[PDB]
Design a protein around this ligand. Structure first.
Ligand SMILES: Nc1nc2c(ncn2[C@@H]2O[C@H](COP(=O)(O)OP(=O)(O)NP(=O)(O)O)[C@@H](O)[C@H]2O)c(=O)[nH]1
Ligand SMILES: Nc1nc2c(ncn2[C@@H]2O[C@H](COP(=O)(O)OP(=O)(O)NP(=O)(O)O)[C@@H](O)[C@H]2O)c(=O)[nH]1
Ligand SMILES: [Mg+2]
Ligand SMILES: [Mg+2]
Ligand SMILES: [Mg+2]
Ligand SMILES: [Mg+2]
Lengths: 320, 320
């Protein structure tokens, strides 16, 4: 079995196809604490041991450590999150081959050439042995590494003439990376990674406007508000009450406005692209501004409505 | 301004393109009561007058009258729902040309030929004058009518050879229609409409499980549960607790299995199709079963992740 994994610092996305020809997409959060969970009842808990350290999946983990999540890519927790993702995917415990991802500025050096040291370091990380109390864990065999962004725009790129170039904008949970690639992957024109902004900006704004606990527990509430930000009817029924709908809609627009300014400002660093694609979980939050501020016809502007999965799907369509 | 309108009996979907080339999609529910609403405060209420009768948008309308929603297509409420959709779309009040829809078995007679009487009846319906208290209403000028299903599969159909044929499966709120159309619209092979089943089957089940009020006010809760039916973490935070997650998950699965059996049984009435497409709001609820029980390669199986909008988008790509 081969599993494609876009192990982001917010959510791990998985995609694979089963014998009955069904293609499955799974998503599992990166929310673990460095200690085992205690269950005196039947509630299932996942306690792991990796590199001698203890870890457990935590549904209410503090949104703390809003610092360097780049190092997370080579961390123990990353290994745990991926294994946990495999365990809750539905697939049967077994040996598996995987293809994981490395952010653009980690996969490539400043010369836009493969950073072999980082790629190997990523493969080595998944060799760290893991254990699960009261259960079996999958066995990761072969590890392949693909860079982010490019796999998502691969389909479109096969269609582009060598002279054309696709601009890929990826808004993630805590990062906003933009790259430009010549048609048929004739070369990488430019890469601009930014780990100072992400969707969490709006999520954090929402958690503030409603004064919600700064943990994973309230992440779903925040996301539902952002996702349905344009449907008052939904908000009316969702927001506790007191109709803070005014303040939250006010907080969201602030953050969204900031995401747009950043993207537009960075966009000014690129030129000559003939096609544009917006991917990542935050795609819907900036697609309008991007399309408005680019000179590209509808025919050449790409965006799906399953944006958080665009990358892992692209990886799949290539390596499966 | 030209507006494409898929006025379904559950939700009115709109799609149009503005000056800055921005393409917008809007959704507005069909939840009205035959009586004005009384507001003693600042809360805005929409009270309409059509054909004399009084109507008003109702956020907590009873899910009553689950009888004939086909006649709804030519009703006064439909006219009100469309006008209400226009008013909450974000577009400026004005004159507008529109393209609306008619279910497959209404647009076509049993000989699969345009039912001109029904088509004209649909156009005439929007000529009924409407009024809004405390505001102006849009003015519907030219009315065009497209059948359901086919516009959604039009893109793919242009690519198919005249000999191939696309099977379009549309699962809506209260209807399940299936059609088979020859490549390049070289002819309609078969139409099978079924107004006995719809997504409301699962929504009703969910409401029963959580014993929620049988009104629109609880429809959002029900839909979030169904949409996130595979994410325990979300369900854990969404469900009012008590972990009825077992009972609701049990209710949903049974309703879903019923939807699947119906679709599979009807599918047995079709043959010779070379491509398959699933659309409508319920697409995600039956896509797997359908792909599993069809002999079609992945390349020839179509499904977007914005299913409720597939039709209106198809209408837009053809008429705009
Ligand atoms: N508004 C909105 N948010 C979405 C949508 N899909 C996913 N999200 C959310 O957007 C955030 C970003 O998701 P994603 O890009 O997958 O995160 P990541 O890849 O883990 N981030 P990073 O690349 O920085 O490591 C998540 O909190 C996710 O739940 C959507 O359609 N709309
Ligand atoms: N599970 C699920 N439900 C969805 C999704 N998108 C929309 N829905 C819901 O599915 C139901 C059906 O939507 P839709 O097909 O547009 O309704 P309709 O077109 O008005 N129905 P009808 O054709 O019978 O007149 C609605 O209650 C809608 O909210 C989705 O991705 N997943
Ligand atoms: Mg990412
Ligand atoms: Mg990764
Ligand atoms: Mg419909
Ligand atoms: Mg209609």
């Amino acid at each position: 079995m081969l599993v494609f994994i876009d192990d982001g610092s917010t959510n791990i996305k998985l995609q694979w196809q089963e014998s009955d020809g069904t293609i499955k997409q799974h998503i599992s959060p990166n929310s673990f604490k460095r200690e085992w969970a205690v269950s005196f009842g039947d509630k299932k808990v996942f306690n792991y041991t990796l590199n001698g350290e203890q870890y457990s999946f935590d549904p209410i983990s503090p949104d703390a450590v809003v610092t360097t999540n780049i190092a997370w890519q080579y961390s123990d927790v990353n290994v745990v999150a991926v294994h946990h993702a495999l365990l809750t995917s539905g697939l049967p415990v077994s040996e598996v081959d995987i293809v994981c991802t490395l952010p653009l500025t980690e996969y490539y050096d400043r010369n836009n050439q493969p950073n072999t040291e980082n790629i190997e370091r990523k493969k080595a990380n998944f060799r760290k042995k893991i254990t699960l109390n009261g259960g079996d864990t999958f066995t990761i065999k072969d590890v392949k590494v693909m860079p982010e962004s490019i796999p998502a725009g691969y389909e479109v790129l096969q269609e582009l003439d060598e002279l054309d170039s696709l601009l890929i904008i990826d808004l993630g949970g805590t990062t906003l990376d933009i790259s430009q690639v010549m048609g048929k992957l004739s070369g990488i024109s430019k890469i601009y990674g930014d780990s100072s902004l992400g969707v969490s900006l709006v999520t954090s704004a929402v958690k503030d406007a409603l004064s919600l606990a700064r943990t994973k527990g309230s992440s779903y509430l925040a996301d539902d508000i952002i996702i349905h930000r344009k449907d008052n009817n939904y908000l009316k029924q969702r927001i506790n009450d007191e109709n803070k709908i005014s303040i939250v809609t006010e907080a969201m627009n602030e953050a969204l406005r900031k995401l747009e300014q950043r993207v537009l400002n960075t966009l000014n660093e690129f030129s000559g692209y003939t096609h544009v694609m917006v991917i990542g979980g935050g795609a819907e939050l900036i697609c309008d501004a991007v399309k408005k501020h680019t000179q590209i016809r509808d025919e050449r502007f790409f965006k799906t409505n399953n944006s958080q999965y665009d990358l892992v799907n692209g990886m799949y369509l290539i390596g499966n």
